[model samples]
Each structure stands twice: as C-alpha cells, then as structure tokens.
Target: LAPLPPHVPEHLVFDFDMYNPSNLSAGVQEAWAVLQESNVPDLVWTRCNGGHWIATRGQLIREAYEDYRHFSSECPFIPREAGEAYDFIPTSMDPPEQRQFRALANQVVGMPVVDKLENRIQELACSLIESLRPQGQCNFTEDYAEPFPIRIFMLLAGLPEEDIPHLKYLTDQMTRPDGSMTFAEAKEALYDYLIPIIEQRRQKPGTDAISIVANGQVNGRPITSDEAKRMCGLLLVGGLDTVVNFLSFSMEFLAKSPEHRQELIQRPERIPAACEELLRRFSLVADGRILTSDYEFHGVQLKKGDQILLPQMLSGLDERENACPMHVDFSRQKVSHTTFGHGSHLXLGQHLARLQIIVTLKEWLTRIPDFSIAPGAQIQHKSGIVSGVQALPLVWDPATTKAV
Candidate 1:
C-alpha cells in the first residue's frame, strides 16, 4: 500500500491488491468480493496500485463504464505504467476515435463469424476432450483449457498452432506479469511478431482475420500499417486471454460440484442456460479506467489521471445485483454481468467466447461426465486483470468416460 493522497479520506481507503488479493487462496472472484462484504464503501480509494479508486457495487461499475466522458479508457489497466504502455486499437481509444476501429474489428469477429465457425468450434472441443477422456487423469489447464480456445483462435487468425507457446507467454505477461518483462517489453514483442504478418497480408490479402484487418480500411482513409499492427496485436491478446482462463474456472467448478454436473447432463437443454449462469458465477476480465478530469463521482473526489478499476466480473457477483451471487443456479432469472463489458466498448469476440464455452461444456460433459479434482491436489487460482486457475488436475475412472 502506498501513502494516501490528502484528497482521499480514511474511510474510503481499502487496500485491495488486484494482482495479489489477500484472500486469493479462497478463490479469485471470492477474494474480490471482500470489498462488497458488509459495510465496504461502494467507491474506494486503494493505495495498492499507485493510489486508485475502485467501484465495489454493480451499479457504480456499470455507471462508470457507461459514463466514459468522466472515466476514460485512455489508460484502461491498473498500475499506470501498464495502461500507459497499452495501445490496442479501439480499446485504448475513446468514443468517436474508438468507433471507426470498432467497426473494422467487428467485420472480422462479429456474431456472423461465430455462426460461420460454429461447426468447427464444436469439432475442436470434441476432438480435444476424447483425446484425454480415456487417460483417466489430465492437467486440465495445459491439456484442454489452453488448446481448446487457443487452437481455434490460431486457426481464425491464420497463425500456426506450433507458435502458441511463444505467443501465449507474451500475451500472459501483458495481462498477468510476474517480473519477467515490463508491459512495454511484452507489447513490443507482440507487435514485432505481427508487423511482418500484417505487412505480408497487406500485399497479398487472404481470408484469415489478420489478412482482412490488415488490408482493410478504417473511417474514410485506408488503415495504416502501424494501425494494422496495433489492431492485430489486440486480436492476438484478446483471443488468447479471456475465454482460455474462463474455461479452467468453469471446469474447476464442474469438477467439484457433482450436482451441477448432473443437472446439465440430465437436462442437456439446460446446458445453454447453465453456460450463462456459469459465466455469471465465475465472471472474469477486468480492466481499469483513467479519470479524464478532476471530478466528484458518487460523492467521492476523483482526480484527473487517477485510475479506477471497474471490474466487469464484479457486476454479476454483487449481491445487490443478484441474490446469492456466488451460487450457480441454471434456472436463475436475468443473469447480469458486463463479462464482455459495458457500454460502447463491448467485446468484439463475445459471441465466439460464448459459443466456445457452450460447446466445451456440452462436449466435455458428454465424454467425461464423472471427473473430479485429483486427490490431494489443491487447485490454485491466479489473480490479475483476468483471473484463472494455475493448474487444474482432474481425474475420473476411465470406464465412466465415453469416446464420443
């Protein structure tokens, strides 16, 4: 914790470190909910990451995101250094400038793309699951979680599956660094990889995502080479980050709760609804907002350039937003969350994430219905901008598994 700024009052101080939350052993999402416990303030000033504000409730988070004029996306990451280094297309750009890039982004990964890729998504999930089903035990994170979403994303981006290791390492450093590299270093490495690809795709356009975005136009002018690299870099990180981590968390839940697994298996139709509920219960993907100007928001004094964390994950998890926010209820009415995001900056790949998640659960449960956390193995969760399970060792009797 850093020294408190004179502008921030003592009652508003809550030292919650997002990178390494105090109660992380309990779980990442659970650790964040500590801010919502009892009488925790709705908006807090935490000195953890250079003294920033955090909106604890769903309403305030949603309001901040919606009110982009005040809370800008110019530097949308904790620890000012990371956000300052972050420059990813529409994500780092605000409003009118954001719109043009967003349109181009949607051209590659919008809902229609998900519909086109549905069969391929389903096939990949089945293939990955059946390959591991007969083994009785497997490291869910490395074995399934990483490959299922990552491979499909590679296929979409026209990248090689063999390159996943190097690219994933770089992308992970950006979202969840561990003193290996600065955010600038990670951003540079990713950009270096995309430059040549974007250049080639510019000269000889192909049907792949990189090719489309590289040779495409933004607004009234042709998108520049530098613009193409930045946008493509965003795609690479976005593709690798969110859903990959989410799969592990969702599977970890299923492995522990036999009843929830049974509920899905018995009523296969409920799998879609279960996916929504599961996303709500285990929502992840949080980014920060840099205050555009010195202003008072919700009775709290916020300074210009001060960053505030508006966790997309926190919305659904707020009890005020949903009763018993942690519990997974397949039949739960109106599941609420900005898991994709809120406002104009909604995720381009949300449809893909949802489709892949729905497919993973339906396919995995069909093949390996009776799996549990490996005996004596304590599944560990890692917290960052995007929360995840470090490793999920799951085991089940081979006889119970099907080769479908």
Candidate 2:
C-alpha cells in the first residue's frame, strides 16, 4: 500500500485490494461488502492495488457510470498497466461516437442472435446437465459451467473448439488474471490469434460474430482492420469470462438450497425472475474508470486521472437498493442491477447471459434437481476484475435424476 496522499484525508482511507480482498476466503461478494458494513463514507481512497478511489455506495456508483464526462471509460482498469493498455472500442471511446459502433456490434450479440441460437443453447444445456446426471458427482465449474457458455460463444464467433484453452487463458488473464501473463502480453497474444482470423473473415465475411463486426460500418465508413481487431478482442474476452462464474455460483446456490431449487422445479415460469435475483445476489464484476478531470463528489476531492472502482456488482447488493441485501428474493416488486452495465458502457452480451442462466436453471433442475456441495470439501472464491469459484465439487444421488 502506498502512503496516503495528503489531499486524501485519513478518514476517507480504505486500502481494499480489488485484485485480492482480505475476505476472499469466505466468498468474493461477501468480501466486497466490508466497504458498506461500517458507517463508511460513500467514496473512499483505497491505497491498495496501486491506490485509487472506490465508490462505496450503489447510488454513487450509478452517478459515476452515467456521467462519462467525469468518469471516462478510457483506461478502465487498476494497477495502471492494464487500464493504460485497455483500448477496446465503443467501451474505450465515450458515447454519441460509442453509440454508433454499438448498432453494428448489436447484430452479433443482439436479440436475433439469441433467437437464432436457441436450439443449440437449449440442447447444450440439456446435454451437459444430463451427461453429468449419471456421475452423481462432478466439478460444475470445469465440467458444465466452463463449457456451456464458452462453447456457445465459440459457436457464435465461429472459432474452433481446440482453441478454447489458448483463448480462455488470455481472456481470463484480462479480468480474473492468474499471473500467467501480463495484460499487455495476454492482449497481444489474443490479437496475434485474431489478426489473421479477422483478416480472413473480412475477405470471406460469413454469418459469424467476428465476421459481422469486421465488415460492420460505423455511419458511412467501414471499420478499419485494426479497429475491427480491437473490438473483436473485447468480444473474445468479454463474452467468455462473465457467465461461466455466474453459472457456477448459481448452481452451487441451488445445490445448497433445495427450497429454492424446488421452487423453480415446481414453477419453471418463475425461472426468469429467479435468474434476475441470482444475478443480483451473486453479482460479479468490478473495474475502474479514470477521472476525465479533477472533480469533487460527495465532498471527496478527486484529481484528474484518478482511477475509481465503480463495481457493477455493488448495486444490487447495496441495502439501500434492496432490503435484506444478501438474501435472494425471486418475487420482489422490482429488481435493480447493472450486471450487464450502465450508461455508455452497457453490455451488448446481456441477452446472451440471461438466456444461458435461464436455460441452465430449467434444464439442470429438471434432471439433477437435488445436489449439494461435496461433503468434507471447501469451496473457495477468487477475486479480481471479475470474481470466480476456484473449484465447485457438487454431488447428488443418481436416483434423484431424470433421463430427459
């Protein structure tokens, strides 16, 4: 931790590490809550992970995200290096201009795309859960969670299945990194793999996500090859990382609470609402946004270029937004969150995430409805830009499952 800056008064100090939180051994989301636990100020100057600001309240996070004038998306990562290297199009550039790129980016992750992949989506969810049915035990994280969304993403991107390991590591390194490579190196490697692929798709445009983005035009001009590659790199990483961890946490939560699992089993229509709650309860993303100019927010003086973590995950769990913040309630009058994102940086992949979670919940419960965390085993969560389960060993009785 660095020495507290003189401008940053002592009371506003909180040295919480986004890369590695102190309470991580318990669970990642719970680890994120200590900021809100005390009578802490809404925003604090955290002297960890290179000493930046953190928006400690849900409303404050919303305030920061929506006003890109103050909190720019350029350099939206901590420890300086990763954010400096960050140049994912649409996201890196602020709105009005960013909005133009999104329409073209939409066709790939858009509603129609989800509609087109519905059968494959349903079949994969059914097959994976059923395939694990006979085992009576499995590591959900590696077995079903990793493959289900990642494979569908590959199918959409038209990438070969064999390349998953190369791609997964690079993408994971970008978010929940494992020290295997620097973000710059991982990004360069991803670019290395995609450069030729993006070029090939440009010459032979096809009905794939990458090809669509390659040939996509912004206003009158077509996107340049470099522009296409940068955007595609974001697609490769952004699409792969999120839903996998979410599905792991969702399954583990269901396994522990038979009542919740049974509620959906008896009423499958409620699955969508339940997915939203789970999305809120187990919210996973946290990344930094740079200050475009020196600003005063809630009496905290932030200088130009200060990086602040506006955790999208924090919104739903904030007690002010939802009563009984930690509990998952399906029938709530309203569900508020920024799981996809908010304002200028909203996610195009939102439709795909919701669809996969719904399919998994419906199919998994239909088959292996009763499962639990493996006895005498510990489930650990890792923290980073996105948090995840290290391993999820789940078990159940084969007799409890149905073939269909």
Candidate 3:
C-alpha cells in the first residue's frame, strides 16, 4: 500500500485507483466513501496521478471556486503533469476574456432561447415518453436519457438532425464511455466535427446558435474561428451531456424511491423545488480549479502549482454544509449549494436545464406513472468530470402506461 499523505490521519491517504480501479465497477462511490470516511479531515492531501490535494469538504470546495485569484480555473482538470487537456470555450477561460465570450454564449442558451423552446420541449418529452411508455422495459440511458436532451440541444443549436447520432456518439465517448474510445480520441473527433461547422457558418451565417457564435464578437472584436470552435464545443458539451447525465441519475433515484416518485406525481407543482433539491443532492460534474498562488486555506497550505479535484456534488451532499445533506427534502427552505460556481461563473444553461427536468418529470410520470430499474440489469455509477450512473435499465407494465 502507498504511504499516507503527511499530516493527514494514516487512513486518509488518497488513492489514485478510482480513475481505473481493478475489480470494482462501483469504484466512484468507493472513492467518495474514502473521502467521507471517519477521521479524515476536510483538506486531505491526495496523491493522485500527478500528486495533488483533494478538497473533500463542501466549504473549501465552494471557497476554491469562489476565490478565482488564489484557486485558478484556467487549469481545473487533473493529472497536471500530463498536460491539462480541455478545450471547451468559455469554461476553460478564467475572467475578463472568460466573461465576454460567456455573454455571447449565453445569448444562445439563456432565458430567451429556453422560452422559445418551451413548447417544443414539452412536445418532445411527451412524444418520447409516449413511445417508450407501453414497452415498460427500456435502457433508460440509451433510450430516454440519451435522446431527450440531445434532440432538444440539436433543435436549439440548429444542427442537422441526421448528425445527432454521429455527434452524440463522439460526445458519449467523452462522458459515459462503453470501453470503445479514449478521451483524447473523443475530443479530437469532436473538434474535427466542429471545424466544418465553423467554416460553413463563417461563409453564410444563419440563425442557428452555432452561427451566432461562429460570427460572434467579444468586446467589439470578431471572435476567431478557433475561438468560435472552442465556445461551440462548450455549448454542445454543456447542452447535451450535463442534463442528460443528471436526468439519468434523477430517473434512477425516482425509480428506486417509489414513495418520492408518487409524491411528485401527485404534486406536479413541486417539480421546480424537487429539481433544485435533486440538483443539490446528486450534483453531477467533476469540474475544479488549480491553485495559482500559495495560500493557506483552513490551515492547509496550497502550493502555487498544485491541482485539486472539486466534485460539484461533494459540497452540496456534505451533511456539515447542509442541515441534512443526503436527504432530498423539497419543502426545505433556504437551500443553497455551490453545485454551480458561486460567483459569475455559474451555469449558463441552468435555466433550460431546469425547464427540461421539470417538464421531464411532469410528462414521464403522467404517462408511465410507474417504473423500476430493470431486474438483474445491474446499474453502476462512475466519476470523472461528471458523477452519474453508467446505465439504468428500467422495466414496468406496458399495459398500464400508454406508449406514445
């Protein structure tokens, strides 16, 4: 066994095996269990791939995200020695330049776009659920989780519907992998797809979100094609993957907890509150920041070049941070968590995500009303930038719920 991190309790030595652990399909939860274990402090030194600290406490995670000066978002990803590899638009950017492009990107996914897509969203949810309702058995991930959000994203981004499978295939490799492709290859494939889209939109701009971004200007200067590609990448990734992964978790939880599902079914009005609670309880996304300057946080010293992993859900689920973190009580007032960043870097597509999730619960429950994780399907969860179940096989009575 590796030596424990200095100054930490002997048991608190961070294990790097979670990334590619052997003999454990449920390794992500195992990793988190290590963090939540007794005797471990909030700031335990983790000897990950590149040797960095892992902030297990919600308070420090929030502080790290908030204080961008001390904790930088420029290189938020891990394996610092292995070259920080990410190219998604405004996300990779840190302020000043980050803020300007974010505004233009927001023009596409913000409130206006969500309002415009509202009716279409409702129609799509009902349509998809209806088709799968009667079947009673569905691979929730590939069936509903995959299509629902991407189709909405496709229509919103104005991408060709035919390209949905191809693009989604590449994006999935980056997120929920099936042991087919490496992260590097998946990213390269996405970039290749965006290159043509950028070139096409540059020549003859259209009303598509991609077009607006391809021809976008940041602070009175035209955005470069390379910049346009990066921004579009963030939109596509954010637009497609974020909610999809989240909804899958939501569905799985609802399936297991019939009482909660029934409550939501009876009280459609609580969808918004429930959405917030679910987001807080099971926040996805393993996004984080690297320490830019030496700073002492909670008596823990962060070196100038050290990288840290701040799972978005870590703090929100922290019992110390919330009155009852693990429990999802929609009626609970004053719920606040840094599942998203604290300051301006908060989620851009949060509005649409809210609408999509609300509409999903409303439509699906109304149609199917009852479902369960498929027997012997063996659902498993994992961690990377996002934390969610890999697959959710759902089964129910087809006769009861009318198929759309």
Candidate 4:
C-alpha cells in the first residue's frame, strides 16, 4: 500500500479547466498521458472557468465520497451554481433523505428488472445489428449505439417505441455538436417530459417503473411530482449515454486491436469481467465535486465552497489502486474499483447495463463478430458531462460469421 499523505489535510483541491496542459480531450491515449505523470499531492489545483480540485488519486477520491459529511454529495460536482442546481433521482439526494427511495429505484433498475428484460434486450441487440449487417457500412453511433440503449430504456420504463427518435434527438442535443444547452437545459427538458408522465401516473398508476416512482413515498409521504420527475430524469439521462458511449469506445478499441477482440471472441466467458474492467478503465463520468462547508480534512483546510472534479475513470486506472492497471488482464482474480462509488450512491442503472453489455457482446459477436472502423473514417469523439465517440463508422464482412 502507498504511504498515506504526510498529514491528512483539511481539504485537497483540483481545477476544472479542461484546456489545461494536461487536459486530454484529444483522446483516451492523451488522457492517459496526463494522468500517468500525476501524483497525489495533499491536493492540487487546476484553473478552469473557476479553480477546482482535481483529486488525482483514487484513495482520496474514495475517501471524499465515502466521508460525505466532509466531501458531501449534496453537490458532489463543481461549479457552485451548477452543483447546487444538480438534481436527479438519488444522485442529487443525500443520505437519510437519499436512502428512502433506493429500494424503489432498485425495483426499476435492479437485477430482477434486468432479468425480466433479457429476451427483449437480446432481441434489440440482434435486430439493431441485423439492420446494419448488410449495409456493411453505417455510423455506429446513430445506427446502433443510440438505438440499442435508447430502445432498452424505453422498454424498461414502459415507454412507446416510436418516441425513441424524438427523445433521442433532444438527448443528443444535450451533448456533442448540437451544443445548444447547458446542463440546466437538458435537465429541464427531461423534467418537462417526465412531468406529464408523473401526472398521469398519479391519476392512474400503472405497472411501469415511472408509475411505481410516481405512486411511491419517500420519508413516509408520497413522493412529490417534482421529486418523481427529477429522479426519473436522472435515471433517463444516466441510462441515456454511458453504455452507448462505452459500446462505441469498446468497438472502436476492439476494431483497432484485433488481437484483443479475437481473444475475447475465443473466450466468450471473459466478457463479463472484461466489461467490469473496461467500465473501470473507461468509466464515462468526468464530473466534479464541491465542498459543502469549510472544514479540516487530513490536515488540509478547505473553504466551504471549493470545487473539485474527479474523473470516474481515474481510480481503476491508477497503478496504485490496481496492479497492472494499464494492461487489460481479464484473468486477474480480484478487480475492485471506484468506477462505481464505494457505497449507496452506486449507479442505479448498472445491473441492467451489465446484462445489456454482456448480451451485446454475445449476440453481436456471434453474428457480425469481426468489424473495424471503416477505412479512412476519422472516428471523432465528444466530451462533456458524459464522454463517447462522436461518430463511429464501421465496416465488416458479415460472411466471416453467422448470417443475421
């Protein structure tokens, strides 16, 4: 184990400026370049629109999250206004208050829900891949990435399949090129969509997840329409991009490195561990945290409102946290990580996501097993609250594998 810092500081800090000399918006490789050279100072600062802490090390970041009283989740991310403004299901709630709805939230996103949707999940993966198999050329993001998870979320939430396109469009606008809205706009848009649903569920509760939340109570009283919408909005957004972006990244990486791809192909059972490893290595959230109050932590004194940005991808990648962190060694016996936080606030959609991912790899590879980025297609990526490929144009010969 690495030595603990000389003194536990009252607070450690990092900056949020992505344009820093170390910022790796260029690509994952570039991001790795920046992180490789960093060390856990008592804390370090980076200057963005406003200065914030870049909790570089996993242990400290974990401490910050687990000791929420010190590192409070009330506004776990940066930008004081933005942090205070943050609201979404349990993501925005603190404990005691936050714990109330977890079980109910779990009902919609937990293992049982995923099991019930297994057939539907597999069917969608196959259907989406089949549509692109013959063309031999399609933008993976538009043609598959968005559709796969978007439709799955729809089904799980019991939404109409046809509305996929419009909702997806708005969600798309929230990130990448549309660049039209701040996080607030996207939050409001989602809230707006769910408000009516909340109202409907209140009037006539149904079997759907939304209805469950709508009719459910938190802290012994019925959850308010606003609270229901906010929570549902988070679920919708959380499910919206992480897996899609991750799938794109996985395909792109696999396409680039056929050896790794083929190794997984030969040993399909490795997919689950591989998924956990990749999620840890490529975890999508790059958001920040804000100190709720001025306090002494590990000896460093922090102001009440210091902002900090901790990348979800950092912990698992740090060599200190995982032995041979850089190498994608699926055979390793123990692989634990903070890609998902240490405790309760763990991802709500993760179980269903794991099932979908395992299913995606299994079904897609069984059919169009070998595919690569189309020759000369410069695969660009987008970064924001969530990070993923902007577009992935892939080309593969379906004849090599079983027909769709």
Candidate 5:
C-alpha cells in the first residue's frame, strides 16, 4: 500500500487499489462494492496510486459530478500524470466551454445518427452470430465482443477495418494501460493518427462522423482541426471501450444462468428491460474529477488538486439506491441507477451503445438459444477505468442452433 497523505483521517482510510483491486476473481462490480460495505465509510481515502479519494455511494458521486465548480473535470483520470495528459475535448472541459463543443459531438453520435445506423447494427449482429452458430464453440470476446462494436465504431468514424488492430491497441492502453507506454504517449499516438485524417476530411466532407466533425460548427463557428480530433478521440473511447467490455459481462451472465437466457428467448419484448438491468448490474466506467478549490464535501476535507474517483459503475450497484442492487430483476416497478451518467456530462453515445446491446441479445438468443461456459473454464476479469472479461469461452451443440 502507498503511504497515506497527512490530511487524511485514520477513520476514513480504505487501502483499496482501483487498477488491481483485491478479490478481483469474484467480479469487478463485486470488487468495487467492497467500498460500500456496511462496515466501510461512505467516502474513503485509498493510499493507492498516489493517494486519492473515492466516493462509494451514488448520492455523493452525483453531487460531486453536478457541482462542477468545486469538482472540476480538468483532471478526470486517476494518477496525476494520466489526468494531466487527458485533454479530450468536451469530456475534459467544464461547462460553458464544454457546452460549446458538445453540440458538434451530439450531431455525430446522438440518437439521429443511431437511427441511421440501425440497419447496419442489426445486419452485423446477425452476420456475426450466424457465422459462429455453425461452429458450436468460439471465444466470445475476440470473435464477437471486440469486432462487433469496434467495426461499428470504425464504420461510424470513417476508419478502415484494417486499422482496428493499431487503434484498438491504443484505445486499450488509455483505459487499461499495461505500462508499455504512458497515457500521454498513447493519447498522442491517437491524435497523430487523427490529425492527417481530420485535415483530409475537412477538405472533402462526407456523411461519416469524422468528416462531419472535421467540418462541423460549434456555436455557429467552425471548429478547429485540433478540436475535431479531441471530440473524435472521446467517441473512439465510447465506441471501442464501453459496450465492448459490457457485452462480455452480460454474455457471461447469460452463459452461467440459463433461466435468464430463456427469459429473453421466451419473451423477445423483454430484451430491452433485460438490457437495462444488465447495464445496471454490470455497470462499468469509473471516471472522476479534480478539485478546483479547497472545500468540505459530505463532511470530508478535500484540498485543491485532489482527484476523487466518482465511479459510474458504483452508482447502480449501491444498495441504498436500489434494493438488492446485485439481483437482476427485469420486472421491477422502478429501476433506479446512473448506469449511463447523471448530470451535464452524461454519455452522448448511450443511444448507440444501447442499440448495439439490445440488438446483440435479441439476435444472439434467437440464433443460439442455448450455450454455456466451456466446462472447467474460468472467466477472468480485468479492472481499471473500464472493467472487462479477459476471455469468454462458450460451447453449445450445433444442432441446438438454427441457421437464422
């Protein structure tokens, strides 16, 4: 454990590591919930990764995100250098300035764009599942999880499929860096790749996301090339990281629990509700904000430049917010949580993310109605800003699956 800062009180200390938490073998959400246990305090200081604070409940997390004046998004990532290096427009900026850039961002991944891509999303889901249906066994993460969303993102961003290997490596490094390079280096590589492409798209515009972003206007003014790259980088992370990992978690649950899969397979209409519950249960993405000034929040003393992790994943999992938060109940009277986000900086690409997830579930269950984790195969999960399964090996009888 790292040494605690002098300002932290002894009663509020919880030596938890966000990057590699203890008892991760249980599950990422379960591991994070350790902070919200009855014995633990509402907010605690972890002497891990340079001594940062974490908001363990939904109430404090929402309050911190809503009060951007005190809790600034200037340095949103953990570990000081990565946060300092994180300069993706809109996401890294606070309001007024952030609102100016968000209009252009909304145009690219908003509901309208999602509606336009509905056909493509459905087609891809059907195609990928059919190809694997006949095989009877496949690595879900590599075969489907990675390609489905990444390919859709590439198509949306006007990137070539062949570039996925390089771009995905860079994107992965930003969220789950293995120390081969610093976050700054990975971010710079993405910017370098987009610089020339943004320039090209501005000259010859198209309907693609990058082209639109390159030539689009923010607050009635044309956005700069640099501004376009920053916005597109955030979109890349949303597309490549969020749903790619979520699908693995959702599918892993389906593999282990036959009843849940049969529930969806029996009533296709329930797929959407099931999707929401799954999103709540397996919620990921733990981004944070840096303190802009010295302040006391929820009875805790916080100093300027202090980074507090306001986990989007923790909100949905908090028992105080939702009864039996871990239980997946599609028929609930009220499903309360912040799976997407809460305040001004709520996720813009959520429409697309949900569309892809619902389509995957409906299509996959319709084709391969029955499948299970390969016998004696243990699923491994990795934790960081975003958490995900390392691999998901699934097996079923070819005769059980239909050609559809």
Candidate 6:
C-alpha cells in the first residue's frame, strides 16, 4: 500500500488509480462513479499515482475550480512530471494571462468557426454511417469513432490525411502513454512536427486553423512562434481526442438501450437534449490543479505544490447534483453537469464537439435504427486523462437499416 500523507486522515484515504482503476473493466464512467458511492467521502486523499487529493463531490469541485487562487492550474496533471510537461498555452496558464491565448484559440475553434464546418460535419457523419450500414457489423472505434472527429479535425487544421497516423500516435502517447516515451518526449515530438508547420503557415497563411493561429495576435500583440505552436498543440489534442472517444461511449450506450434509441428516433428534436444528458452520464476528463500556497480547504490542510484532481466526470455523476445520476434520461427536467469543464479553462472546442455529437445521433439513428453489442463480446474501457472504449464491436441487420 502507498504511504498515506501526514495531514490526510485514514478514513479519508481511498487508493484509486485514475489511469487504471480496479473497477475499470466494469466501465470507464462506472469506474470513476465509484468516487461518489456511499462509502467514499466528498473530499478524499488517494495514495495512488504518487498520492493526490480528489474532490469527489460537485460542490467541492466547483469551488476548487472557481477558487483558482488557491488551486492553481500551473500543474494540472498528476505525477508532477506530466504536469510540469503540460505547458499548453491557455489551459496551462491562469486567468487574465490565460484569456489572451483563449481569444486566439476561440478564433479557430469557437462556434463561429464550427458554423463554417457544419455542412462538412453533417456530410462526414452521414458518409461514415452510410459506409458502415452495408457492412452489417463493424469495430465502431476503428471505423467511425476514430475517423469522424479526426477527419474533421484534419480538415480544420489543414493537415494531410497521411499525417494523422504519425500525429495521432504522438497525441495518444501524451494522454495514454504506453510507457515507450515520457510525456515530455511525446510532447516534444508533437512540437517538432508543429514547428515547421507553424513557420510555413506564417509565411503563406491559409483559412485553416493552424494558419489562423500561426498568423494570429493575442492582446493586440503578434503571437510568438512558440506561443502559436503551444496553442495549436492544444487544439490538436482537443479535436483529435475529446469527441472521438465520447462518440464511442454515447454510441455504446445507445446500442444497448433500445428504449433510449427509440425515444431519440421518435422525437428527433429531443436529440439535442438527449446529447446533453448523455454528456453528463458519460462525462470524461480528470484534470487537477496545484495548490498555490499552504491553505485549508473543506477542513483539509493543503500544502504548497499539492495536486488535487477536480474531476469533470464526477460532478454530474454525483447524486447530490443530479437525481439518479447514472440513469440516462433524455427528457431530464434540469440536467446539470460540468462535462465540458468549469472556471476560466472551459473547453474551447465544446461547440464543435456538440455539433459533431448532435449530427452523429440524428444521422446514425436515421440510417441504422437498430444495433447492439456483438454476441458474446465484452466492451472494455480504458481510463486515463481522457477515458475511452478499447473496442466497440457493434452488430446490426442490414435489412433494418434504411437509406439516408
């Protein structure tokens, strides 16, 4: 057992690993929901991943995120090294200073940009689903989950399809490292790739995300090449990883729950609301903040440089925040959660993520109305900074699918 810290009480200690939880085989969200169970405290210290405090309740989580002065975003990731290596522009910086880069980021990923890509987003979703419908079965993760958001991201970034394999391999190593390379090495590799691209874009700017960011300005001053590369790196991580994994989780849920699928199919307008509900239940992303100074929060003494995980996934899953938190209810009266994020660092690509999700649900169900987990197959989830399905083997009858 990992040694408990001097300040942490024994009762408040829960030895859980964020990257690989004991309950992970059950489900990624289910594994994290273990934090909200009756036995677990709202605020607890875990002697896992070199020891860190976890805010298990929505109340504590929101407070911590809001109170950035006490809980700094300087070292957002755990194990110290990864956090130190996590120097992505706005996300790695605090407010006021962080806002400058955020504005530049918004120019590339915000809603206005998504509106431009709406037609292409719909087209891609329809095309991917249509291609799979005739197959009668597919490894959803390999076929749709990986391609849909990634292809859109590649298009948005002005990157060639050929570059995805190299970039994606590097990106995955940062979040869910296979231990072949350190986070810093993985991060540097991504930067190495972006450096040349950033320089080229600045010389002859295009309408793509990288060009806009490369030639963009922050706070009325021209952005440095280093700053542009860091910000663009973040955008790549957001676009390549976030919604790609989420779609798998949402689709897996829909395949298993016929009633939920029927409800969405019957009332297509409710698809937006249903998307919100699913986002809450299946919310993933567990980033933390480092303590700025010695402070007492919620009856616990935190020393300077202490890292605490304010899980975005746990807030909505807390029964106190939403009744029957685990159950997916499309018509939920007052669905509340911090799935995207909270405080100044809320996800910039959320609009694009939602647009992709909403389009996928509307298009997929319209085509393949009936589908389920393949016979005798088990769906496994991998947990990390962003959790994802290992593989989703879905099966459906071609006879049931209709032409879009």
Provide the TM-score for each candidate, comma-separated: 0.98, 0.98, 0.90, 0.89, 0.98, 0.98
Q: Model 1 over residues 9-32: C-alpha lDDT tens digits?
A: 999999999988999999999999
Q: What TM-score does candidate 1 get on C-alpha atoms? A: 0.98
Whole-model lDDT, candidate 6?
Answer: 0.91
Q: Per-residue lDDT of 1-404 in model 3, one digit per residue for the tens?
A: 33444544444355644355343364343456457656777776666554667788778888777787777777766555222667677876777668998889888999998898899999988888888876778888888887888988998778878998788777766665556876667777888898998899899999899999999888889999999987888788787778888888888889888888888888888888998888887787666678788788887767777777776667776777778666778887867777665655788888898898899988888888888888777778866666667788998987767544
lDDT of 6 at 365: 95
lDDT of 6 at 7: 73
Candidate 5's C-alpha runs over 4 A off are none
Q: Rank by lDDT, descending?
A: 5, 6, 1, 2, 3, 4
Question: Whole-model Cα lDDT per candidate?
Answer: 0.90, 0.88, 0.76, 0.70, 0.91, 0.91
lDDT of 4 by residue, 1-404 (tens): 12223332323333334423344445763463354454446356654545566666677767777766656666755445556667766876777678887877887888888888888888888888777777767788888878898887887787898877666655654433254665566667777778888898899999888998889877778888887887787777666767888888777776777777777889998899888877766666666566778776555566777766666666777677788776666676777576666656877677877887788777777777778888887776555556678788888876776765
RMSD of each candidate relative to the true structure:
1.1, 1.0, 2.9, 4.7, 1.0, 1.0
TM-score of 5: 0.98
Which residue segments of model 6 deviate by more than 4 Å?
Answer: none
The residue-by-residue lDDT of candidate 5 on 1-404, one tens digit each, is 66777888989999888889998999999999999999998889998988899999999999999999999998999888999999998989998789988879889899999999899999999999999999999999999999999998899888999999888889888998888978899999999999999999899999999999989999999999988999888888888888999999999999989999989988999999999999999998898999999999989999998899999999889998899998998886677778888778998888999999999999999999999999999898999898889999999999999986
- Taking the tens digit of each residue's C-alpha lDDT, what string does model 2 give over 1-404? 98787788898888899888988877888899888886878899889877899997899999999999899998898878899998887788887678888877788888999999999999999888878899999999999999999999999999999999989989889888888888888889999999999899999999899999999898878999999998899888867888998999888788789899889998889999999999999999998699989899988899998899999999888898888888888898788888778887788888988999999998888888899999988888888888888899999999988998
- After superposing all C-alphas onto the true structure, candidate 5 shows an RMSD in angstroms of 1.0
Error of 4 at 19 (Å): 8.1
> What number of clashing residue pairs does each candidate have, in the order they appear?
0, 0, 5, 22, 0, 0
